[PDB]
Amino acid sequence: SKPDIKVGDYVKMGVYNNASILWRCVSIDNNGPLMLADKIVDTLAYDAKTNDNSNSKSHSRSYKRDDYGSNYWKDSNMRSWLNSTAAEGKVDWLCGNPPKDGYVSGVGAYNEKAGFLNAFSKSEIAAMKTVTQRSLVSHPEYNKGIVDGDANSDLLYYTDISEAVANYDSSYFETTTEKVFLLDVKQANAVWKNLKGYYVAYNNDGMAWPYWLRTPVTDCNHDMRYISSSGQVGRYAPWYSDLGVRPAFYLDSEYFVTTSGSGSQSSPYIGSAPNKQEDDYTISEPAEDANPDWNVSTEQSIQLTLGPWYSNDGKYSNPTIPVYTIQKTRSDTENMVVVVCGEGYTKSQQGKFINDVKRLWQDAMKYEPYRSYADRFNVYALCTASESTFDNGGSTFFDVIVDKYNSPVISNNLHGSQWKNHIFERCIGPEFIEKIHDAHIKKKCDPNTIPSGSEYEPYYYVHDYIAQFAMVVNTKSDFGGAYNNREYGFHYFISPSDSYRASKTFAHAFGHGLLGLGDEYSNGYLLDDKELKSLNLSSVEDPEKIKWRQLLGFRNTYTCRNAYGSKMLVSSYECIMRDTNYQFCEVCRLQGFKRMSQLVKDVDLYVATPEVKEYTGAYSKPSDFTDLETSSYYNYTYNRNDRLLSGNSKSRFNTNMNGKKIELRTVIQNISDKNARQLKFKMWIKHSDGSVATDSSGNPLQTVQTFDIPVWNDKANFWPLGALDHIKSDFNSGLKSCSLIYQIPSDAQLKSGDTVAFQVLDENGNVLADDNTETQRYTTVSIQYKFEDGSEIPNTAGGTFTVPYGTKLDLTPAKTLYDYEFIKVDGLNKPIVSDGTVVTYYYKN
Ligand SMILES: [Zn+2]
Ligand SMILES: [Zn+2]
Ligand SMILES: [Zn+2]
Numbered sequence: 001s002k003p004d005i006k007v008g009d010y011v012k013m014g015v016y017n018n019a020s021i022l023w024r025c026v027s028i029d030n031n032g033p034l035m036l037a038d039k040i041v042d043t044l045a046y047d048a049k050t051n052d053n054s055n056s057k058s059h060s061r062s063y064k065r066d067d068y069g070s071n072y073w074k075d076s077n078m079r080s081w082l083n084s085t086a087a088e089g090k091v092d093w094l095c096g097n098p099p100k101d102g103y104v105s106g107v108g109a110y111n112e113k114a115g116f117l118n119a120f121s122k123s124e125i126a127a128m129k130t131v132t133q134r135s136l137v138s139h140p141e142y143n144k145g146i147v148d149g150d151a152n153s154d155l156l157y158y159t160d161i162s163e164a165v166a167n168y169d170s171s172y173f174e175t176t177t178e179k180v181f182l183l184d185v186k187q188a189n190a191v192w193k194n195l196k197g198y199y200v201a202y203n204n205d206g207m208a209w210p211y212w213l214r215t216p217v218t219d220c221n222h223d224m225r226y227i228s229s230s231g232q233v234g235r236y237a238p239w240y241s242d243l244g245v246r247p248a249f250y251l252d253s254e255y256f257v258t259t260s261g262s263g264s265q266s267s268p269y270i271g272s273a274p275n276k277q278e279d280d281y282t283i284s285e286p287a288e289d290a291n292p293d294w295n296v297s298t299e300q301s302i303q304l305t306l307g308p309w310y311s312n313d314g315k316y317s318n319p320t321i322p323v324y325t326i327q328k329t330r331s332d333t334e335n336m337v338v339v340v341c342g343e344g345y346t347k348s349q350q351g352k353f354i355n356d357v358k359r360l361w362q363d364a365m366k367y368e369p370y371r372s373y374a375d376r377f378n379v380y381a382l383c384t385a386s387e388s389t390f391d392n393g394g395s396t397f398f399d400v401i402v403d404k405y406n407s408p409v410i411s412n413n414l415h416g417s418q419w420k421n422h423i424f425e426r427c428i429g430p431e432f433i434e435k436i437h438d439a440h441i442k443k444k445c446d447p448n449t450i451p452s453g454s455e456y457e458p459y460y461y462v463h464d465y466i467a468q469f470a471m472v473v474n475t476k477s478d479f480g481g482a483y484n485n486r487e488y489g490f491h492y493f494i495s496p497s498d499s500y501r502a503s504k505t506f507a508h509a510f511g512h513g514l515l516g517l518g519d520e521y522s523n524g525y526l527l528d529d530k531e532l533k534s535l536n537l538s539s540v541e542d543p544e545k546i547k548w549r550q551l552l553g554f555r556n557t558y559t560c561r562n563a564y565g566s567k568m569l570v571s572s573y574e575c576i577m578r579d580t581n582y583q584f585c586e587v588c589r590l591q592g593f594k595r596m597s598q599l600v601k602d603v604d605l606y607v608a609t610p611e612v613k614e615y616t617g618a619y620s621k622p623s624d625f626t627d628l629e630t631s632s633y634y635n636y637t638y639n640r641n642d643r644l645l646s647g648n649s650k651s652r653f654n655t656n657m658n659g660k661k662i663e664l665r666t667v668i669q670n671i672s673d674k675n676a677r678q679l680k681f682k683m684w685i686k687h688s689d690g691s692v693a694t695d696s697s698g699n700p701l702q703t704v705q706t707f708d709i710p711v712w713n714d715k716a717n718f719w720p721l722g723a724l725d726h727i728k729s730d731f732n733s734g735l736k737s738c739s740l741i742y743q744i745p746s747d748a749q750l751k752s753g754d755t756v757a758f759q760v761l762d763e764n765g766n767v768l769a770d771d772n773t774e775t776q777r778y779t780t781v782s783i784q785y786k787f788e789d790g791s792e793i794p795n796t797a798g799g800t801f802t803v804p805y806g807t808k809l810d811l812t813p814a815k816t817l818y819d820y821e822f823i824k825v826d827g828l829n830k831p832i833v834s835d836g837t838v839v840t841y842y843y844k845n
Contacts (some may be wrong), residue, residue, distance in 0.1 A: 035249050052098065078216075104241045147478055180248070209244045232756050344386050346391075398410055433462065464721055467514055478501060518537050524619065547731035562578060782837065809832065
């Protein structure tokens, strides 16, 4: 038969200690029916003290785990034993500290013990569903960024089972997938609710026994929550062998078939799932080779001579770094060159690096202000082999450590290399510019020698020719680092490859490095000179004096404090700089666009997406913008949406809007210091048919207003090429907030489906923006680099960037790709209309 598993069902699956284990389905939940050992299978210790390795995995993150053991579940001796089929003496102990004698209290010694699953048959293991569950993480874990999700709180400690679950879902967590697991607090309380006093365990004698739970004490580094004989959830040090094991699995109901039994306590459902197909169960990671080979091509490479100051141990004394062109739309001189490098990527895992870079890069290019410049970035991935992965703790190429604050820092001290943080500017950068870059600037100085006048001066050229240095770490850890002191040569960011926020963190850190933007969450008064120094942060309360006064009232720009009472002020509560979920704010888009325009010579104007809003007069004057609370910001956003007649709200227009003023508004920045720009704005009510709407007397309902945008004199002072810092500049230079207000006539003829239509025209009549722009379709373009015969050029991994629909890409193709010479381009100067359009640059050899 195929059973139906109810709460209280008893199954007899597997054998431990030569007795089949009676499991009971305590709860039914989303993953499946939950089977819990009826009696504590054995009396063992969650995790022994640190014996073998203290520099890798859980025992590394706190040194008190030498004394007591580790409350990390993924590494635990319990997870390793419960989920092992291994023969005796061969259980992989994931943390690397086995449950050896003298590290588990008392007799202990469950190293040399066969895995729990070893005596089981393969079919019985198949019947346990491989489930991905949240496991709360302790402070050593959540300060080294070992967290799969957003949630910020420590679990509150309540001993009663009723109150034990408090804060669980809001608590720090990471997701672990396994067949056999010890119950967490939520699941123990579920067992309680469904099955009364069954949450108190009983051993073979029948005396009540404490049993371990996988929930750690989030405030503590070693302690583990456990269920005692009385029934109190409590904390025990994990090294002790007094406490019991009550393993639980999730039945895979569909394949499961019970050959015998009714599921009663006396007569359990005896069953397994034969036809279910699985690779042999191994929670253990596959073992890669000691000496890898490159997954990727080495045909195009840069070779670095790193002396003692850069590699004191000597493992990177002459690295060969393969180079991959993810994007080379134009020449390096004309474009912004981004160099991404790899941390904790072994030779065999370099393909992953390339794909990761592509992933992250493309996701970053979905964000504006980058999207406007997507085709202007030259993107290069440098394959920097690491002897070990980041999580293995072996020597990594860049020596990245994570400090106590979750900050990822290249450590000069770790291998005793004083100048490791200077590797990008002094070692990697000069070689890239000499070899890969079209400028081919020969290296004037020896990084290994000592410069004569300023130890930081000669390397200043690197940052001109390379816009950004990025480091991607082969980690699911969540951390971000931005290092932006050009005087001392530091222009680089460190970000993770597979964190839940990997692409968001990448975009954020890129915003520091290239755009120059600061963290909007940071708390602290900005004094006068520092206040001039910050592009996106101000401590000026008065709306009339604030830097972004012109942009106030545009889209979601209301000036608000980042945190309560704080003297630090931001243009929008929702920006990527404060919260990585949210997109870049208008001040950031403007300032980053201006910075990138300094880097590339084509752009002449910035037109923010115009918005048509009804003109109540709310938020129309500087006084209205005085309140600086976050609540007031959200009230402004509500009023804006209730007024908005543009974009997605283009259909909010109605027959009643006669006698009502409507306001078209944009912010326009003139990127040209030399010549001022006259831009015409046209706003007419549009019938669904498409003809301009009329009043009763037939006069068209349309408004025209010509705004002249001034020159950008302070251009030289705002992030010029060749600039160490933004010491002072004027926000308002070259910036005009253009507002056209139209009184819809009181006698106007309005029908259903009429919508406001606006063209922002230049002098020649080219339409810079229109009512379709905000909603306009973005179509993916893939750039490919091929030989004449159609064979793929090696060391090129073309990315995908989004261009607006109907965009005709007109970018002079780069004369040379590596030593290859450009013969033709396919797909340029043609409307891009399909997602997945491919532009193929053909080079010859
Ligand atoms: Zn351990
Ligand atoms: Zn930041
Ligand atoms: Zn912002």
